[PDB]
């Protein structure tokens, strides 16, 4: 079988997420691309647990914890987004370059 292709897709996702992390002109989109990167990492973890850890399932547990951390980040922001929009009424992150 061609299970290794999954790894390839994960790598692609990582790079794509990385790309979407940089060219983001909207911090909500940057958060979504952070979710994309964590999802690629989770894909790697799950397929490695399938490959080598059929008994202990350490990769699946690590995937669950990474999902928990990603949801915690998704709860912390957009609350940070809420504070930013309440104070500045704008979301575009490249336009804020006061600290430089």
Q: Which of residues 59-78 bind another protein (CB under 8 A)?
A: 59-78
Smallest gap, in angstroms, from Cβ of residue 60 to another protein? Answer: 5
Measured CA to CA, the distance from residue 61 to residue 69 in angstroms comes to 12
Smallest gap, in angstroms, from Cβ of residue 90 to another protein? Answer: 9
Buried/exposed 15-46: b ≥16 CB within 10 Å, e otherwise: eebeebbeebeebeebbebbbbbbbbbbbbbb
3-state secondary structure of 53: coil
Question: In angstroms, what is the C-alpha Rg of the chain?
Answer: 17
Q: Which of residues 31-60 bind another protein (CB under 8 A)?
A: 31-60
Q: Which of residues 78-97 bind another protein (CB under 8 A)?
A: 78-88, 91, 93, 96-97
Smallest gap, in angstroms, from Cβ of residue 92 to another protein? Answer: 10
What is the size of the binding site for another protein (CB under 8 A)?
93
Smallest gap, in angstroms, from Cβ of residue 35 to another protein? Answer: 7
């Amino acid at each position: 079988m061609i299970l290794e292709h999954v790894l390839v897709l994960s790598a692609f996702l990582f790079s794509i997420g990385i790309y979407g992390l940089v060219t983001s002109r909207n911090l909500v989109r940057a958060l979504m691309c952070l979710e994309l990167i964590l999802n690629a990492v989770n894909l790697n973890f799950v397929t490695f647990s399938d490959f080598f850890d059929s008994r202990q399932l350490k990769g699946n547990i690590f995937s669950i914890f990474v999902i928990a951390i990603a949801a915690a980040e998704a709860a912390i922001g957009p609350a940070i987004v809420s504070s930013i929009y309440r104070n500045r009424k704008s979301i575009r992150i490249n336009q804020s370059n006061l600290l430089n």
